[model samples]
Target: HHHHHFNLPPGNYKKPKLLYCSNGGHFLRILPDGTVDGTRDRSDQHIQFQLSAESVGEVYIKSTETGQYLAMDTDGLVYGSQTPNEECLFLERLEENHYNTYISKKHAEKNWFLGLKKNGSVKRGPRTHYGQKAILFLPLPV
Candidate 1:
């Protein structure tokens, strides 16, 4: 697998980092056309996001490259948009295994979460504890 490194200082909580995918072995990237996918071998500025703390266990994921935020529609589709609508907010739920699950605030009918599909596309769906691709977050090494 390919890896990309940046000269970011340590403990810079404000600085964005690549949201590495543990199951797909790829990085989450937002294309210029607003497509959200997890197929990038290496993390670039386009894939880095500033995970700002919104509240307890909640964050606002803002893309550093495009200045857009990650949002999921009611139809369980993930995309990047400039608007900070209800879909753009996510709750960082901590699991027993020490992994964080990003739950969509707008769509919670069936516990919808930010999951990675087999095709490497980003989608929102029901929680899957055994499915690593469905919910996993690894910060890129500084």
Candidate 2:
């Protein structure tokens, strides 16, 4: 039920960069056939993500329960849903259309599914927003 709007180039509205969510967890997934998938947690929640003008920036809202989050490069390319309802503190809206979230001093310190190898590697990197888990929304950037 959550929605977002992006300020993009006049005619580029048809090709939105991407639209995704991370509230229900399982933010990213790699199918057995090598296909990648994304599932946003709490589909009905108000948590949302949107791109600012020029696609230069994005805005994210965390679910009141488990702040939204994004995936990192080092994250293992899984062949399926590895973690569900995982917690995060920080979020990054990438220019590539995909967004990333993380945990910071403000939110939880550990990533969800901690004992699992596939989910554990998705750690807080040296990025400036590392650790601050938050909701992530990537509105259509067309």
Candidate 3:
């Protein structure tokens, strides 16, 4: 946990946030069937995620609507699975303090990230990177 290198506060933080892609015009969403996508409008249902944080800033992101934990696979596919596994751990990295980016703890050593394209399409983790505008997100409260 590289706490001192980031601007995110360390604490027993827990709450919900609507993740809006910084470079895209959509918000992150996870449906009941364990699929993830981006909504064309901010008002779409299932777009909010409850963030569970531990010391040093690691987190578990679960969809409040479906009660599903955000998870990823070795192939870099993202989903909100029924149960959390190693892939559920996330690093909400603050590439730019005001806004941030998310990546799986399992892939921390790899260059992967959660992102959406301009057309509201989700990006494969292997296809994402820190500098891409699609990778940055703004956590907004509902």
lDDT per residue, candidate 3, 22-93, as tens digits? 776689989888888888677788998888874356788888888999888889999888887889988876
lDDT of 2: 0.29
**TM-score per candidate:** 0.79, 0.22, 0.89
Per-residue lDDT over 1-142 for candidate 2, one digit per residue giving the tens place of the 0 to 100 score: 0121222222222332333333334343222332334544334332233222222322222222233232222342222222222222122223224444322212223232111112312323332232232234334332
**TM-score quality measure for candidate 3:** 0.89
Q: After superposition, how far is residue 116 of candidate 3 from its true place, in Å?
A: 0.7
Worst 10 residues of 3 by lDDT: 3-12
- What do the candidate models score in CA lDDT, each in turn? 0.67, 0.29, 0.79
What tens-digit string does per-residue lDDT give for candidate 1 at 10-98?
23345777777666666778877888888766635677788876655556888878988888886777889887778888766555355
Q: Which candidate has the top score in TM-score? A: 3
Candidate 3: Cα lDDT at 41: 79
Q: What is the lDDT of residue 39 in candidate 1?
A: 71
Full candidate order by TM-score, most accurate first: 3, 1, 2
Q: How far is candidate 3 from the true structure (C-alpha RMSD, Å)?
A: 2.4
Off by over 4 Å in 2: 1-25, 28-46, 54-122, 127-142
- lDDT winner: 3
